[PDB]
Structure formats: C-alpha cells, structure tokens
Nucleic acid binder design. Structure first.
Ligand SMILES: [Mg+2]
Ligand SMILES: [Mg+2]
Ligand SMILES: [Mg+2]
Ligand SMILES: [Mg+2]
Ligand SMILES: [Mg+2]
Ligand SMILES: [Mg+2]
Ligand SMILES: [Mg+2]
Ligand SMILES: [Mg+2]
Ligand SMILES: [Mg+2]
Ligand SMILES: [Mg+2]
Ligand SMILES: [Mg+2]
Ligand SMILES: [Mg+2]
Ligand SMILES: [Zn+2]
Lengths: 178, 83, 57, 116
RNA sequence: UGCCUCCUAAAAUGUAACGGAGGCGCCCAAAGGUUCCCUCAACCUGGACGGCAAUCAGGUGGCGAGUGUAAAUGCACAAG
RNA sequence: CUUCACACAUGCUACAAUGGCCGGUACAAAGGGCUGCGAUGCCGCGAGGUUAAGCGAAUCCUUAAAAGCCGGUCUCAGUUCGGAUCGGGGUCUGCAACUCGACCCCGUGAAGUCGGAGUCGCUAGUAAUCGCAGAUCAGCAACGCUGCGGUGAAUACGUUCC
C-alpha cells in the first residue's frame, strides 16, 4: 500500500467536501493518469534515441515507454512521416501514486534554484502540466549510464471540473506553488 | 585587495552616496566610475552604471557575481567581427 | 506484455540527511537511495540604500 | 583492474598508473599510496585485491574523480557564461580567457589556420 | 494517331472539331486473402529546448483529412 | 597603445634514452646592496610570513652556480616526452591587479614523432650547450639587451661556380 494513496483517502478525500460544497462522494476529484514524455526532436538525424530516451524513463517511472511516430512530414525539421520523434510512458494505479510521491518528496525540490511551480498552468478543465529542464533529479539514473541531457514535461490529469477545484486537489497532494 | 590579509576592496566614495534614502522608498541607480571595486556580499539586488570608457552600462548584481570586480560586466572593446 | 520487458521494480527505503524517512517502490538497485534534502528540510516549504552607509561609517 | 572506473593499464608502476584517473595527478598519487601503505615501486599486475580495497575508499573521503569533477569543471565554465562577465563573453566566442595575446598566437583556443 | 477520367453532351445510353483540362506503357510478396480493433484534418487551451507547424494532455470537431499512381464516382457502417 | 578571419620577422620551449625523474655529491667568474641586502631560528607542502645578527662593504649579505661525476628507476610509448590551454585555491608589490602584473600549490595534458621551396650563423677557447649578475625597476609581461665564466668540437682539397 503506497503512502500517498492511503493519505489521499485519509484527509484529502474529506477536506474537499468542506472546501467545496459537494453533495455526493462520487463528485470528489482524483488524479486518474500521469503522462510523461520526452519528445526527442533531435532523433530525425542518426536515430539514436533507443539507448537514450527509452532506457531512462524505464528507470524513472518503472515501465518501458512507447516509441511514437510522426503524423506528417515537415521539411524544415528533416522530419519524415513514419520516424521516431517522441517517447511516452503512461502511469496508472499504484505506479501513479508512487511516482507523484517520489516527485514531490525528493525529485522536484532538488532543481537548482527552485522557487516553485506556476499555479497558472491549468488548461481550463483541471488538468495540470509542467516541464523540467534536464535529465532531472531522479536518482535511478546516473552519469555513468547517460548520454546528452534531455528534458521532459509531465501531464497530470484529474477528474476535477474547473481550475481551482483541481488546484486545491494538488495542493493537498504536495505540489508547491508560488 | 587580492590578498587574504587586507580583506576585499571597495572604494570609499562608492558607499556613502546615499544618506537619507531609508524613508522615501527609492532604489536609485549609481552613476559610478569605480570599475575596480570588488562586489562584496552586501550589494545583493542593487544596481550600478559602470563606465566602460564611452558610456555607462547598467549591471544588476543578482547573487552569483559576488566574487568578481565591478568592471567585468561593462566591456570596453567593441568588436562586431572582421567580415 | 506485462511480462519480461519492464525493468525490475521492487521495494526501496529512502532516508534523508534531516532524518525524514519513508518506504516506497522504485528501480534503485538495493534499496539504497540517499538524498540530502527532502520535502520537509528545504526552503519554499518552511521559509533603503543607506545600508551602504551603515557598514564602513 | 578497475579502481574507480578508469581501468588502469597492465604492466605499469603504481605511481604513474594511478595518474590515468581523471582527477589524480602525480602529487596526489604520492599521498594515495602513502596513507594506504602500498609501495610506489610495484607493478599493477601484482595488485592484491585486498590492497585495492584500501584505496577504493580513501578517494571518496578527500579526493575527487571522474563525473563529479568533470561536472564541477563544466559547471564553472557554464556559470561564467550566463552572468555576462568578461570571461563569459570570452568562453562563448573561443578566444583565450586569461588575458593572452590575440594578435600573433592563441592557436590552442582556436583551430589550425583558417586561410582567408 | 492506341488506352484511361472529367467538361462540351442539350437531367437514360450515344454524340463531332488541329474544341477545353490532366494522366498511362506501371507499381505491391504486401500496398493481396481473412479475422479483430481504432477514428481523422483543422481550430482552441495548458506545456523544457519548441518556433505558424515536430511529440504530450484536455476540449471542440460528422467528415473539411486520407486513398501507391490522373480525374470522376465512391468510402466515416469505412474501401482511411 | 594588450583588439583578431589572417600574413611576415626575431626568439624561447619542444618533439626525448647523448634523455625524463628521484637521492647523494664537487668545481666558477664578473657584478648589486641604506627609500636597502635579510644571515640565523621559527610557522608554512610552496610562493612567502614574522623575528633580527652583521654590513655603506676584498669584512656582511646576495651565494644553493647549473652542466658534470656516482646510484636507483622508467623501456620506445603521443609515453613518467612535451607543458600550451582551462578549472579551483593562494602569496607579494602597489591607493587599486576586471579590461591588463609576475610568482606558487592542486587538477586538466593541446599541438608536436626533427620540418617543402627557400634560407641563416660560425675558422678555436670559436660554433654548440649550461647556469649567474647587471642596467631601467614599487612590481613585472626579462624567453629581450649588455656583460661574465663552465664544459668544448668538426673540418678548410681548393678558387671552377653563387
Ligand atoms: Mg448523357
Ligand atoms: Mg438527353
Ligand atoms: Mg502524353
Ligand atoms: Mg493484411
Ligand atoms: Mg483497411
Ligand atoms: Mg606597442
Ligand atoms: Mg619547513
Ligand atoms: Mg598528432
Ligand atoms: Mg614531465
Ligand atoms: Mg619516438
Ligand atoms: Mg674569419
Ligand atoms: Mg627588477
Ligand atoms: Zn530532510
């Protein structure tokens, strides 16, 4: 039993019924999936992302990601239709809560000169998205087994209906906001 | 002055330029010429206009330029290139 | 496909230099993940010009 | 015979053999082999694996090796650039940084002759 | 100069001109057979490098994409 | 006056075994010192810090000359050759070392494997190599310049040609 999931249905599940006037317990917001992709656009030349962007998100998240192909061909990028350009993993269930636990506790507050994450980054539904700068804090990867740096951006998808409804869900989970 | 026996070096005219500005809420930029003054760990967040020979260049001391001289941020040789 | 493709993912205990510790599940080989700053011993989680004249005058 | 991650070449005296570690030169090699008692005049093929334990741990106490020194180098080169100092203007273009002469020389900080 | 598609062609078919527009002398061992599954383009919002546009997530979107190859008839039940 | 796509000239250090490094150990000459020379002792890995004897000097300081000889080690490798570059930490002089000072310690270890056409110096204590002192000078970019002594060759048939 992961510790953030049991803490979710201990006080977070109850605190939102007082802050927001829900009549039913089925209206309570909950994060459903967390999506992490690299998006290695420097893979249209020499095609070296198999060792790079696959063997690290397998170490960060816990399951091997999906090599994604291009939809159409754009000439200014040397990008042909049917060429690996992005690498995406999807986290559900126990591995979702154990990724957000390892993110907020030890990974996210060790960015160099970290002053929070912007609370203006909600889409209009209640789904949150931020980015990272480099092959990040995540201690499962080391310098002995990495190539060049690459960044990721992380989608957090909740069942909330509006922005502050989903912002208040992520406050109790442990996302910092400035 | 570069040795750890007489501390860092700041010119005496650089400091006392302000006397009664604790109570009228201003952050006035310093029109200075002393390029040789070491940025000690007390100029943090302030600003300076450093004379590079022909004009004054605005530098903003953030936190990480705390071991360098003040003149290292106004270059004195213009060089766009040969061709 | 949830068989012999994904890497090994077993229990792992994390400790901090402050003393905060908890138990999670990650791909660290051996359960020996070591941090030196965590979510409770970090800043942002717990918090005129005449000062020129005050120092050397 | 991997010592810290550099794979020391065989048939070599240990005073020079420990210098191929990125971060250990000749002076530090005299005081790695002093605190561990290993004699200098000794081939690396006769390196006892129990003796290899005595100096695979002394380095993390005081010294610094591959990775966590090479990143300390390339972050200091990084730090001078974005703050906009004179040496940061000088590390971007490639001209030498310690006040050298740029008129007749400085072919180390540049390539071979460009031949305009 | 043969074959293919539209228009002229007068609401079945057919219909001339040294009349008006374009293609073909192939390609595919899967781009064939079957079985099972899926819905696209554009726009909007949020997002590290990332830009009008690479990849992601959420909305809106009934066919405006796509079809090995010209145009016509078709095809979203898909033949994509 | 120190810029820098390049080009020329004068030098220094190299490409190593007739050598690199480590340990012991001999032999100089001419010069400088009161706005100075800092012996000895002590602190510091080191540049240096501090204390202070003697000395306007054939007295004292500079002063440890280095090549050399002896022993050990490295075994032909872009290396224990080479020390450019760059990172970090220091010391001294000066009101002040960023543009733009030497020096010291630690890490980094680029080019270079003896050089095309062409060209330069030298007839004996000479070339070649090795250190030392001076002047200007607070400091030094002195690898320059002017001096000093150490070890010390090879050849000159000859006057046809440049
Ligand atoms: Mg008809
Ligand atoms: Mg009819
Ligand atoms: Mg034709
Ligand atoms: Mg098929
Ligand atoms: Mg089909
Ligand atoms: Mg001049
Ligand atoms: Mg001593
Ligand atoms: Mg070479
Ligand atoms: Mg050497
Ligand atoms: Mg050789
Ligand atoms: Mg003569
Ligand atoms: Mg002098
Ligand atoms: Zn802690």
């Amino acid at each position: 039993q992961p510790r953030l999931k049991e803490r979710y249905r201990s006080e977070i599940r109850d605190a939102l019924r007082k802050q927001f006037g829900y009549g039913n317990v089925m209206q309570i917001p909950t994060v459903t999936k967390v999506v992490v992709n690299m998006g290695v656009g420097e893979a249209a030349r020499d095609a070296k992302l198999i060792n790079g962007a696959v063997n690290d998100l397998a170490l960060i998240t816990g399951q091997k990601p999906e090599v994604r192909r291009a939809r159409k061909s754009i000439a200014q990028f040397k990008l042909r239709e049917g060429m690996p350009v992005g690498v995406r993993v999807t986290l559900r269930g126990d591995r979702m809560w154990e990724f957000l636990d390892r993110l907020t506790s030890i990974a996210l507050p060790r960015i160099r000169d970290f002053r929070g994450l912007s609370p203006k980054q909600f889409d209009g539904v209640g789904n949150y998205t931020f980015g990272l700068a480099e092959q990040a804090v995540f201690h499962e990867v080391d310098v002995d087994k990495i190539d060049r740096v690459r960044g990721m951006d992380i989608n957090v998808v909740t069942s909330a209906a509006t922005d502050d409804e989903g912002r208040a869900l992520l406050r109790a989970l442990g996302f910092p906001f400035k | 002055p570069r040795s750890l026996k007489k501390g860092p070096f700041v010119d005496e005219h650089l400091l006392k330029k302000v006397d009664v500005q604790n109570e009228k809420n201003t952050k006035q930029v310093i029109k200075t010429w002393s390029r040789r003054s070491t940025i000690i760990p007390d100029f943090i967040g302030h600003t300076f206009a450093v004379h590079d020979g022909r004009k004054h260049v605005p530098v903003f001391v953030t936190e990480s330029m705390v071991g360098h001289k003040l003149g290292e941020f106004a270059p004195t040789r213009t060089f766009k290139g040969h061709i | 496909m949830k068989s012999d493709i994904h890497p090994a993912y077993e229990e792992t205990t994390v400790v901090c230099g402050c003393g905060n510790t908890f138990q999670t599940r990650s791909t660290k080989p051996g359960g020996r993940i070591v941090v030196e700053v965590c979510s409770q011993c970090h800043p942002f989680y717990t918090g005129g010009r005449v000062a020129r004249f005050e120092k050397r005058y | 015979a991997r010592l810290v991650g550099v794979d020391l070449p065989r048939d070599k005296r240990m005073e020079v053999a420990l210098t191929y570690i990125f971060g250990i030169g000749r002076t530090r090699s005299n005081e790695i082999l002093a605190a561990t008692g290993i004699d200098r005049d000794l081939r690396t093929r006769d390196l006892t694996e129990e003796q290899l334990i005595h100096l695979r741990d002394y380095i993390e106490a005081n010294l610094k090796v591959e990775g966590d020194l090479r990143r300390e180098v390339q972050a200091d080169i990084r730090r001078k650039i974005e703050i906009g100092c004179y040496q940061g203007l000088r590390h971007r273009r490639g001209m030498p940084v310690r006040g050298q002469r740029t008129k007749t020389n400085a072919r180390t900080r540049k390539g071979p002759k460009r031949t305009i």
